[PDB]
């Protein structure tokens, strides 16, 4: 946490706590200027709690004095921490006006609300006057700037503690908090600026949960040496589809090809295999003879043979979920000595003992419905639960990619959060594409974790490049957009 980071900076490095608070407040002023333009025309209402969030707010208020049209502080706390007390004292010596009573109509006479009520010190549900003021701010239509985290967001989870401020702009200190990255918190944060307030870079860099950034993805993209051939770029087998679900294999296979993979082979029940090469003749789509249109133990030996001459196997999209599919998936994965990307129906039937016993690596790519079924919990218990995802990945020796508007990627030691993408991905097929992308990057030589990190970012970024309204995006268009995402990343 930042809490350790502040403590160490004050207590070991010897930076006065007041210097950190001064730097915090001025960052807020500079950030607002960058967003609003010249501040001198605006009237500011600063809502200060009795903690250090509020102390940061007093610094903001004091620094606007004499330079803007009007500043008023509403002090909502009871007691004040020492630094809040000190900065309150300064605000008042500088000529500032504080009131401790909030009237519904005071929003009327101001243009900007600075929300310095609660930061990382929030504990428990917000009620009483705190709640009523937050609710009035949210109904006011004013520009809202939140200091550190919008008041009411739990900064460790992104959950709303009964009510919370909806900000246009949030200025946070040092590092983003998990609460800005996970929803609903991500939504209520608005535009996020991360301010440097003087922590040693070494401490800032020691945080073990990160946002996946463009620079990180750029440095992981594999090299394309000119003297190369398709084998340079790896071979993927995708075991997918059924008589019910004939489209999934095609989207996965192209997903691998669009990220630069050299050779992609599908194993799909006949005649559904013919669908892939009618759409994309660059694919190899091997026909698998099945009794009733679904993979079963009858196909185990053929699939292991096909596996020998590839670098990675993806399994699951469109397989169906019946007992014979379950038997096949689990015996295949138990015997396969190649990295496996396990998705969709292969997750739904997976025996997790199999994962622990495997010597080769695995990535799992569940949405929360699948994760919920896999660990026998409710969707609400697993959704955005990064600590559960970490425990799962660590216990089963895998990489877990837990899909949602913010995607979590973890191997149990390191956890990354993806924030690219939009609601155009909220449509059948988009998951199938990501599976192929991950397998592809593994085939090109990236680690399972690296392959997942690059893929989730690029997959969301390709969606953002869609030229028309995002709700009309389909998986086939997403595929077309991948090579543009790649170019824009470089």
């Amino acid at each position: 946490h930042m809490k350790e980071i502040d403590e160490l900076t004050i207590k070991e490095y010897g930076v006065d706590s007041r210097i950190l608070m001064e730097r915090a407040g001025i960052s807020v002023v500079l950030a607002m200027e960058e967003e609003l333009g010249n501040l001198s025309d605006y009237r500011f209402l600063v809502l200060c709690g009795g903690g250090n969030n509020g102390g940061d707010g007093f610094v903001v208020a004091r620094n606007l004095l004499g330079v803007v049209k009007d500043v008023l502080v509403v002090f909502l706390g009871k007691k004040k921490t020492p630094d809040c007390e000190y900065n309150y004292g300064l605000y008042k010596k500088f000529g500032g006006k504080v009131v401790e009573q909030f009237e519904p109509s005071i929003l009327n006479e101001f243009d900007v609300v600075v929300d310095a009520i609660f930061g990382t010190g929030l504990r428990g549900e917000i009620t009483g006057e705190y709640a009523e003021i937050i609710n009035l701010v949210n109904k006011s239509g004013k520009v809202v700037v939140s200091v550190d985290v919008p008041s009411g967001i739990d900064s460790n989870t992104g959950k709303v503690l009964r009510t919370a401020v909806k900000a246009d702009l949030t200025v946070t200190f040092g590092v983003p908090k998990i609460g800005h990255i996970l929803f609903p918190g991500r939504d209520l944060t608005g535009k996020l600026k991360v301010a440097n307030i003087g922590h040693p870079v070494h401490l800032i860099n020691s945080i073990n949960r990160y946002v996946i950034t463009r620079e990180m993805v750029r440095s992981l993209l594999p090299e394309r040496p000119r003297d190369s051939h398709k084998g340079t770029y790896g071979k993927v087998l995708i075991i997918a589809g059924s008589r019910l679900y004939s489209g999934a294999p095609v989207l996965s296979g192209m997903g691998s090809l669009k990220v630069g993979t050299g050779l992609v082979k599908l194993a799909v029940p006949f005649p559904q295999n013919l669908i892939a090469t009618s759409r994309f003749p660059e694919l190899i789509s091997v026909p698998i003879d099945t009794e009733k249109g679904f993979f079963s133990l009858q196909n185990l030996q053929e699939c292991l043979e096909l596996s020998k001459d590839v670098d990675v196997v993806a399994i699951g999209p469109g397989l169906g979920n019946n007992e014979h599919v379950r038997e096949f998936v689990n015996e295949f994965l138990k015997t396969l000595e190649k990295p496996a990307v396990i998705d969709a129906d292969a997750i739904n039937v997976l025996d997790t003992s199999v994962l622990k016993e495997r010597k080769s690596p695995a990535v799992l790519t569940p949405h929360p419905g699948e994760m919920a079924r896999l660990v026998k919990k409710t969707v609400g218990d697993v959704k955005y639960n990064y600590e559960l995802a970490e425990e799962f990945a660590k216990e089963n020796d895998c990489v877990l990619v837990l899909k949602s508007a913010t995607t979590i990627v973890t191997d149990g030691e390191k956890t990354l959060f993806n924030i690219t993408g939009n609601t155009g991905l909220s449509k059948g097929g988009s998951g199938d594409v990501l599976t192929g992308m991950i397998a592809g990057f593994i085939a090109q030589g990236l680690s399972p974790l690296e392959a997942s990190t690059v893929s989730v970012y690029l997959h969301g970024f390709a969606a953002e490049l869609f030229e028309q309204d995002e709700r009309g995006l389909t998986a086939s268009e997403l595929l077309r957009l991948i090579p543009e995402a790649i170019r824009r990343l470089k």
Binding site: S27, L30, A31, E34, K193, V194, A195, N196
Partner: peptide, 6 residues
């Protein structure tokens, strides 16, 4: 870049 990351 010195003060703010986007």
């Amino acid at each position: 870049a010195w003060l703010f990351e986007a």
